[PDB]
């Protein structure tokens, strides 16, 4: 099945289907705890702890209930609750939070917000990229209340440039083009792409993707789309055939 309770209970195992582990850094801030629950199991995570994605299904969004807490003088205080989403590929994975409740400035109040957490995996080294050819990636774009978006992305490894498109999100303004952008090395010389998104040729935000896998099998990242109701965040993950 979805292996949600397995993920909350079992040690990492490299013989499980990759990606087998994701380090929770953005997803759990220092001074805070993240409690995930699903299928009758629960686990509490701190900053830097591993999430066992090896037990989860590939190419799908896995969903947990979450509580964000802080420990104050021996007592656990709930700051936020909602759904924690995990999208798993073979060399990459990402997390996201759909907030449903926050503290009532000792009570909770309803509040909805969607953000991307961690994007990680087996980063492709910029210095070990294919020297040429053109790779096509297909996968998913997901945002608040919508995991049905389709991402297409193409990389030209000679030009070291990529571009793509998001389609089929229920909110039409989110189905943006991912404009041509250069592959660059980041601080650790990981291969990364950052560029603008476009809607009807108009600039409408940005996107960034990492390249993952020894043979650049995968891309994963996120986009920010500017709207009159705020920035909307979209998780991005795609893979070659």
């Amino acid at each position: 099945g979805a292996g949600l309770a397995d993920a909350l209970t079992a040690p990492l195992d490299h013989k499980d289907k990759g990606l087998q582990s994701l380090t929770l850094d953005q997803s759990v801030r220092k001074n805070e705890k993240l409690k995930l629950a699903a299928q009758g199991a629960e686990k509490t995570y701190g900053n830097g702890d591993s999430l066992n994605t090896g037990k989860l299904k590939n190419d799908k969004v896995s969903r947990f209930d979450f509580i964000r807490q802080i420990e104050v003088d021996g007592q656990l205080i709930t700051l936020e609750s909602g759904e924690f989403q995990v999208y798993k590929q073979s060399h990459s994975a990402l997390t996201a939070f759909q907030t449903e409740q926050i503290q009532d400035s000792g009570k909770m109040v309803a509040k909805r917000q969607f953000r991307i957490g961690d994007i990680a995996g087996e980063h492709t080294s910029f210095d070990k990229l294919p020297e040429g050819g053109r790779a096509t990636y297909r996968g998913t774009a997901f945002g608040s209340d919508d995991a049905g978006g389709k991402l297409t992305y193409t990389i030209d490894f000679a030009a070291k440039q990529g571009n793509g498109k998001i389609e089929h999100l229920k909110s039409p303004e989110l189905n943006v083009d991912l404009a041509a952008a250069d592959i660059k090395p980041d601080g650790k010389r990981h291969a990364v792409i950052s560029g603008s998104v476009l809607y009807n040729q108009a600039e409408k935000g940005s996107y960034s993707l990492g390249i993952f896998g020894g043979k650049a099998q995968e891309v994963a990242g996120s986009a920010e789309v500017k709207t009159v109701n705020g920035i909307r965040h979209i998780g991005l993950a795609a893979k070659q055939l």
Partner: antibody, heavy 118, light 113 residues
Amino acid sequence: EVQLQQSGPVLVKPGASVKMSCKASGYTFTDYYMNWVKQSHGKSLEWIGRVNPSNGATTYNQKFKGKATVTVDKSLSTSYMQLNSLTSEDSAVYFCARDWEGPWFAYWGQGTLVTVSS
Amino acid sequence: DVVMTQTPLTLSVTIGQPASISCKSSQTLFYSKGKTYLNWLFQRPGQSPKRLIYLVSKLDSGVPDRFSGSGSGTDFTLKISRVEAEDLGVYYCLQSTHFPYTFGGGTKLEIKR
């Protein structure tokens, strides 16, 4: 910083038993398998067994069946290995080592030197 | 059990020269596509082993790039492009595809000077 801190050297008598410990710090103990390994003086390494710290399930090298028992105490983030019916062939250094199959760092304890003598 | 036949037993090498160690298994260490569990370890006298290479060819953090691993199936090789003085010690291969896990007998690298 991760450490695997093993218990100190010990002398034990032939025919008796010995129990040694590996205390893990700096990571969630239940997230990784733990291995135990034997090294007789001047010899190669020998794998004894592996434990799942989250539930205590174990796998053993059949050469150590009835000799070695591996356990854990989650609340103390510690693994233990007990050797029974000791002989001079059990005199060796024993190591605990975290899961070494994957990209996650393969930590080793500092070893415990066991001497079997009367 | 899977027998790991590691050769040479001793390698005597001058600083700056290359070095190669071979490990042959009695049955293939292929686990599944892209996963072959062959590690190379290194141990200084009186100290604990450390891992240098995992999954045949992946270098651990904190290991110089002079070290490389290759091979497939039953035949694996650790290479040191140019030996430095601190490379002396004992190197072991280790398979984790099959239980029981098993180790080569070790290669002791000694420095000629």
